[PDB]
C-alpha cells in the first residue's frame, strides 16, 4: 500500500527525492544517466564515478528482530555481446550493510540476481534467481525486471520476480539486523565495464502479499503508455523492428509486390534469436497537436510507416481491394494512406494495432495468415482463449547498445 511505504525514490525537480514523507536524502555522485522518457529510471556504471547514495532518515533505519519488511525495485541488466558477461563473479549493485556487513545486499552474477540478508551476529541467508541464456527470446536480458523481497521475521524470506515467487528460505535463525545508514547504488567488483538500470526503489515496513506485489508490478509503470520490447515507453518517430508474439522465431520482411512476409526464420547466436532482423517501422501521430509528447498511449490514432531507408518512409495500409475477409498489409510507394488510421492498444507489454477506415469502420487487428501479414477482424472475438490468439500481439524492438549482435 502506501501506509507501509517508509522509502520511495522518485524523480522530481532535476534530482531524486523521497516521497514517503520520512525525508531520506538522495545524492547523485558523478555521471548518472537519466532516462529522457522516464527520469525515475537511472543508470550507474563502473568505468567512471557513478553512484546514487540514499542517506536514510534515523527513524527508518532497520534495527529490529521481529519487524517484517519489504524491498521493491526494477533492474535492467544488459549482456551486450553475451560473451563479456560470461564470467563467474558475484558483483554487488545495491549495498545496505555496515562496516561489519550487517544489513542487506543486492548483487549480480552472469544472468543471476542475488539477495543477501545478514544479521548483527554474522548469520546470513541468500536467495537467487538465474534466468539463463536466451533460448529463442529472453524475457529478462536487457529488459526491466521487477524484483520484490518480502521478509517475515517469524518465517521465510521470499524473492519475487515479475510478481511470481521463485525462492523462499527461512530467516528464523537470524536475530537483530542493523542495516546501513546508506543505501548505495554502485557497481562494485565487476570484472568488466558495464552499466545497470534501476527504477522505482521502495522500502516498506511490512511483508507484502502476492496481491500487493502484483498491484505494484501492474501499476508502477504507467498502464496508459505502451511499452517497447525492453519495457521502456513506446515512442513516436522511433525506428523499431517487429516481433510477433505467436511466432517468436520469425521476422517480417518486405516483398516486391509491397506485401509483408512472416515466413522468414530468425538466425541464432548460440541459442538466442537475432532481434535486429527484418523491416523497420515508425509510429507517427495523425493528429499532431504539437503540444503532445512522443509517448504512445492506449487508443491513440496513429500511422504505421515502413522504413525503406532512414529518410524514406512509406505508409503501411490494408489493401481492401480483395474478396477475402482478411486484408493484406501493403506498402504505399506513392505516400497514399488510403483513408485509413491505426488505433494503438495494449495488453501488458504486448501491443495491438487496429487498422480502421476514416469513416470509423473496422478493417482488423494486425496479424498474419499463412505467410503474409494481414489485418483481420477474427481476432476481435478470439483475443484470449484460442491457439492463435497471440497472433495479433506485437513487440517493438529498438536497436540499442545493451544488446549487441553481429
Amino acid at each position, epitope marked *: 500500500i502506501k501506509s507501509s511505504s517508509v522509502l520511495n525514490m522518485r524523480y522530481k525537480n532535476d534530482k531524486y527525492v523521497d516521497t514517503s514523507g520520512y525525508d531520506s536524502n538522495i545524492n547523485i555522485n558523478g555521471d548518472v544517466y537519466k532516462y529522457p522518457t522516464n527520469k525515475n529510471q537511472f543508470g550507474i556504471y563502473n568505468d567512471k564515478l557513478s553512484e546514487v547514495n540514499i542517506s536514510q532518515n534515523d527513524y527508518i533505519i532497520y534495527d529490529n528482530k521481529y519487524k517484517n519488511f519489504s524491498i521493491s525495485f526494477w533492474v535492467r541488466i544488459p549482456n551486450y555481446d553475451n560473451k563479456i558477461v560470461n564470467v563467474n563473479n558475484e558483483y554487488t549493485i545495491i549495498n545496505c550493510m555496515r562496516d561489519n556487513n550487517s544489513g542487506w545486499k543486492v548483487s549480480l552474477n552472469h544472468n543471476e540476481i542475488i539477495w543477501t540478508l545478514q544479521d548483527n551476529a554474522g548469520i546470513n541467508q541468500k536467495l537467487a534467481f538465474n534466468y539463463g541464456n536466451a533460448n529463442g527470446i529472453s524475457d529478462y536480458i536487457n529488459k526491466w525486471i521487477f524484483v520484490t523481497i518480502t521478509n517475515d521475521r517469524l518465517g521465510d524470506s521470499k524473492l519475487y520476480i515479475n510478481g511470481n515467487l521463485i525462492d523462499q528460505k527461512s530467516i528464523l535463525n537470524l536475530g537483530n539486523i542493523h542495516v546501513s545508514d546508506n543505501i548505495l547504488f554502485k557497481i562494485v567488483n565487476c570484472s568488466y565495464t558495464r552499466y545497470i538500470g534501476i527504477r522505482y526503489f521502495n522500502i516498506f515496513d511490512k511483508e507484502l502479499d502476492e496481491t500487493e506485489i502484483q498491484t505494484l508490478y501492474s501499476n508502477e509503470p504507467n498502464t496508459n503508455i505502451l511499452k517497447d520490447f525492453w519495457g521502456n515507453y513506446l515512442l513516436y518517430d522511433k525506428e523499431y523492428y517487429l516481433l510477433n508474439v505467436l511466432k517468436p522465431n520469425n521476422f517480417i520482411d518486405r516483398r516486391k509486390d509491397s506485401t509483408l512476409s512472416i515466413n522468414n526464420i530468425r538466425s541464432t547466436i548460440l541459442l538466442a534469436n537475432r532481434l535486429y532482423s527484418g523491416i523497420k517501422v515508425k509510429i507517427q501521430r495523425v493528429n499532431n497537436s504539437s503540444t503532445n509528447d512522443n509517448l504512445v498511449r492506449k487508443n491513440d490514432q496513429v500511422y504505421i510507416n515502413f522504413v525503406a531507408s532512414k529518410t524514406h518512409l512509406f505508409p503501411l495500409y490494408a489493401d481492401t481491394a480483395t474478396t*477475402n475477409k482478411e486484408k493484406t498489409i501493403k506498402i504505399s510507394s506513392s505516400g497514399n494512406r488510403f483513408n485509413q488510421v491505426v488505433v494503438m492498444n495494449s495488453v501488458g507489454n504486448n501491443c495491438t494495432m487496429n487498422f480502421k477506415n476514416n469513416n470509423g469502420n473496422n478493417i482488423g487487428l494486425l496479424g498474419f495468415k499463412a505467410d503474409t501479414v*494481414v489485418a483481420s477482424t*477474427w481476432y476481435y472475438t478470439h483475443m484470449r482463449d484460442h*491457439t*492463435n490468439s497471440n497472433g495479433c500481439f506485437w513487440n517493438f524492438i529498438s536497436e540499442e547498445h545493451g544488446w549487441q549482435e553481429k
Partner: nanobody
Amino acid sequence: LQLVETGGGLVKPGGSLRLSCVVSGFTFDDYRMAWVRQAPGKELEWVSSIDSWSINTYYEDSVKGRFTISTDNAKNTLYLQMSSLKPEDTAVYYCAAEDRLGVPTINAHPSKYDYNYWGQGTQVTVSS
C-alpha cells in the same frame, strides 16, 4: 519445403480417383492441409481441408459425400479419395499447406497468399 501431387487421370462420369500429395520439409502437425481446384476459365476454388492434430476435416457444399480428405500416421502424405466423379470436377488439383497459427479463415476463392506452400498440380479429367 515442397509438395508434389500425383494420382490424377482421365475418367468417365461415376468413376473414381485417389490423389496423393507428398511433402518435404515439414509435418502435418504445424500445417493444415488443403486441396484446391482450378477448372478452365474459372478462378481458384477451395475443395477440402484437414487438421491433423485434431479430427477436423472441412469440405465445400458441392463435393461433400464424394470426396474424402486423409492423412497417414507419418503425417507427411496427404490423400483425397474422389468418387462418383461428375464432369464439373474436371480441373487441375493442387495440394496446399496453411500455417495453423494464422487466422483460421477459409476463403472459397483464395489467392496465392492464402496458403504457405502450393504444389505443382495434377490434372483430373471427367469425360464421356
